[PDB]
Design a protein around this nucleic acid. Structure first.
Ligand SMILES: NC(=[NH2+])NCCC[C@H](NC(=O)[C@@H]1CCCN1C(=O)[C@H](N)Cc1ccccc1)[C@H](O)CCl
Ligand SMILES: *[C@@H]1O[C@H](CO)[C@@H](O)[C@H](O)[C@H]1NC(C)=O
Ligand SMILES: [K+]
Ligand code: NA
Lengths: 30, 259
DNA sequence: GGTGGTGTGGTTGG
């Protein structure tokens, strides 16, 4: 923790995914 | 936000509520980009046709929120404004070109689980992510639909809303409206064909349009909710200030007037 | 209530 911009304490920092972030990642493929 | 859903707790820790002191009301969204700087839409601060011209003292900023109306004791933090900076070429007369403003807080805010800044994209990141068909995410406490009864309590969410929307090709944006679109804007939303729906709406301005990099796992703010015609209409799209195209002005303001 | 509607709280005290 220093320039940890854009990494959420309750999500990325806990290796938890939010309920819809899957949808965004799929949009880079299809 | 139209056709979105309730945010999870800590899902947009960079979300900021811009709040009018008197009378006491929600004005707009905004985003936290460091410990002392908040980004929003210029029209939230200055829009003469609606008699809007706020200074530092009219406004509070509220950070860490989930509920729209309740003061979230021990969660949310409230900061006062040192200074507002509106883009010098902001065009309120025609088409809200360069709909962007920076707000310096009097004191840095202490980060928490509920409060944490978003990244701004560099050139590579912009080019990689700002492509038609890729989805981003928009968040806000604005209206749940285009409102036709002048004022309602059924138009407003109790908690922060979220929706994911695809970015749209510049020709489709350009044909969907007669307002003159610029390279300081992009549009997003589903086509009438795609069957899915959703949009930002009035009250969501200043809120961020963010994308998650599949390379470093970080969230970047690519846009600012700026304008539209109605909300969630078929064949219309939401318009967003293009953050990367204005990044030189952002850097310049933060370097010069910056602690 | 206090910068909602119910808690041996909650995203948080009493
Ligand atoms: N995605 C959407 N469908 N709408 C987003 C609207 C966001 C809101 N923006 C607005 O209401 C902006 C400000 C001026 C009029 N306006 C509009 O969006 C006008 N509907 C269209 C317009 C656009 C440009 C110039 C004049 C008129 C903000 O909350 C302030
Ligand atoms: C906005 O309002 C303030 C009134 O305090 C005024 O001094 C300022 O010049 C206004 N700006 C514009 C562009 O109307
Ligand atoms: K309580
Ligand atoms: Na639409």
């Amino acid at each position: 923790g220093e320039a940890d911009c854009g990494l959420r304490p309750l999500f990325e920092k806990k290796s938890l995914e939010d309920k819809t972030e899957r949808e965004l990642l799929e949009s880079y493929i299809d | 936000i139209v056709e979105g859903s309730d945010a999870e707790i800590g899902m947009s820790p960079w979300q900021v509520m811009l709040f009018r002191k008197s009378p006491q009301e929600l004005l707009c969204g905004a985003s936290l980009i460091s410990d002392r700087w908040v980004l929003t839409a210029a029209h939230c601060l200055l829009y003469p046709p609606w008699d809007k011209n706020f200074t530092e003292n009219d406004l509070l900023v509220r950070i860490g929120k989930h509920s729209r109306t309740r003061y979230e004791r021990n969660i949310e933090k409230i900061s006062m404004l040192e200074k507002i900076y509106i883009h010098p070429r902001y065009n309120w007369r025609e088409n809200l070109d360069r709909d962007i403003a920076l707000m310096k807080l009097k004191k840095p805010v202490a980060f928490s689980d509920y409060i944490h800044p978003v990244c701004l994209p560099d050139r590579e990141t912009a080019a990689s992510l700002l492509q038609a068909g890729y989805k981003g995410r928009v968040t806000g406490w604005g209206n749940l639909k285009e409102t036709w009864t002048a004022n309602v309590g059924k138009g407003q969410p109790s908690v922060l809303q979220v929706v994911n929307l695809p970015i749209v090709e510049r020709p489709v944006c350009k044909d969907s409206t007669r307002i003159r679109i610029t390279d300081n804007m992009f549009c997003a939303g589903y086509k009438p064909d795609e069957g899915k729906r959703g949009d930002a709406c009035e009250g969501d301005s200043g809120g961020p349009f963010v994308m998650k990099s599949p390379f470093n796992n970080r969230w970047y703010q690519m846009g600012i909710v700026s304008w539209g015609e109605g909300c969630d209409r078929d064949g219309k799209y939401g318009f967003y200030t293009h953050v990367f195209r204005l990044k030189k002005w952002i850097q310049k303001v933060i370097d010069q007037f910056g602690e």
